[PDB]
């Protein structure tokens, strides 16, 4: 994030990785580039499907030109398969296939460590019920488009996180990024993680896993 | 809770008090009796206002006859003033007056320590959106009736917890108890706790505080 004018800014993807409220850190040469390219591909797929996103263009390498937005202080999580923190909320095992998608709202607040909230907390934070409902509707639509597109490539979309903001017309626009950092991707054949869980739980090689996704999505080996 | 037949059971209120997931325990001679009497008064007030509750009758002392129900595995929390765990979810101080009531759903599960959930988790637990909406509507109605009744007696209803079950007609019925154990009651004049927070945070004498509520509500000193 680095400003350009009133209408747009630069989003730069870095090689840095963090986990567990920032207590785990490492750097992976090439991750910024992979995450940038993959966000681009995802943003363009969603745009074709009529999802408003902040993507404007590529600013070479690890940099995207994105629309400026009044950002909602939310992380919006959609879950298809039980994994991560959902295991501490429902007595269901890792890999449990949900009967329908779960949407969870988290309040972006470092002091409180991003606690889960509901519609009522959101309202006190200044987000109307109508806004929340539009946000969840978009998230669920994004889920269908991504889940289908990836299943046709042997990838299970386990869960993912989105962020949103409001544009000058008061429309709700998909923001941040969509990448193996912010999604769980499982190989359909083997159930193995091809995402940030590789780094989180030391499941092998992060760069190999992200390359895997990139190759399996684009049909080409990453040039860098 | 001790069975009678298919239609009804006994709910006995004991002198035992627990806090902090059961790590804090103590006994207060007379608390069972106070909590029983106060639940009776609250249940009867709500019934007059058209709230369906499980209250059937008094079985002498600390015992109520209550209707048997298919219990939802929920604790339903309504909040008017910021206190307790809400302070860890919203960066708002103790005593902050909410612009409108907050309803929170907790999944009753000791293994998971009663985590907060939303409508989607509820659905996976087998509770339909329609049920959840009816449950919250009742809770918000209970809030208005109790808040008004108590304000007319110099008591601020800060927050409280309800439980619910389904009767043989599939109607949603208010269950468990309503007492200084399951509500925050503040003196309007002084802001002091007249509830289980006295025991939770060692704010003085629990029995005196509960007697206070009882005297201030009934207009009479507790006979036991
Ligand atoms: C809460 C949160 C989730 N996510 C993504 C990662 C996962 O794909 C999905 C669900 O995460 P979750 O299981 O809730 O948390 P954790 O990553 O700590 O196990 O949402 C983020 O990228 N950032 C966040 O701050
Ligand atoms: C979660 C929970 C709340 N409550 C009641 C007590 C309070 O009046 C209100 C809000 O409680 P809360 O502040 O969420 O938890 P704590 O009591 O740990 O501070 O709901 C219960 O009686 N039992 C429960 O298990």
From Swiss-Prot, chains A, B:
InterPro entries: SAICAR_synt/ADE2_N (IPR028923), SAICAR_synt_PurC (IPR033934), SAICAR_synth (IPR001636), SAICAR_synthetase (IPR050089), SAICAR_synthetase_CS (IPR018236)
GO molecular function: ATP binding; phosphoribosylaminoimidazolesuccinocarboxamide synthase activity
Gene Ontology terms: biological process: 'de novo' IMP biosynthetic process; cobalamin biosynthetic process
Keyword field contains Oxidoreductase: no
Keyword terms, alphabetized: ATP-binding, Ligase, Nucleotide-binding, Purine biosynthesis
Enzyme Commission number, as recorded: 6.3.2.6
Superkingdom of the organism of origin: Archaea
Pfam family, one: SAICAR_synt
Protein name: Phosphoribosylaminoimidazole-succinocarboxamide synthase
């Amino acid at each position: 994030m680095i400003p350009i004018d009133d209408d747009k800014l630069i989003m730069e993807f870095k090689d840095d990785a963090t986990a567990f409220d920032g207590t785990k850190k490492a750097r992976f040469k090439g991750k910024g580039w992979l995450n940038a390219q993959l966000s681009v591909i995802f943003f363009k797929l969603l745009e074709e499907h009529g999802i408003k996103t902040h993507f404007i263009g590529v600013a070479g390498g690890n940099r995207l030109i994105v629309e400026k937005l009044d950002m909602y202080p939310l992380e919006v999580v959609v879950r298809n398969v039980v994994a991560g923190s959902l295991k501490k909320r429902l007595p269901l095992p890792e890999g449990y296939e949900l009967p329908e998608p779960i949407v969870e709202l988290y309040y972006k607040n470092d002091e409180l460590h991003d606690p889960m909230i509901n519609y009522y907390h959101a309202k006190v934070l200044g987000i109307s019920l109508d806004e929340i409902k539009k946000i969840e509707e978009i998230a669920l639509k994004v889920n269908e488009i991504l889940k289908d597109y990836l299943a046709k490539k042997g990838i299970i979309l386990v869960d993912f996180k989105l962020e949103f903001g409001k544009d000058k017309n008061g429309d709700i626009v998909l923001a941040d990024e969509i990448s193996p950092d912010t999604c769980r991707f499982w190989d359909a054949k083997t159930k193995r993680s091809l995402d940030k869980d590789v780094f989180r739980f030391d499941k092998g090689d992060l760069i190999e896993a992200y390359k895997e996704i990139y190759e399996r999505i684009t049909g080409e080996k990453p040039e860098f």
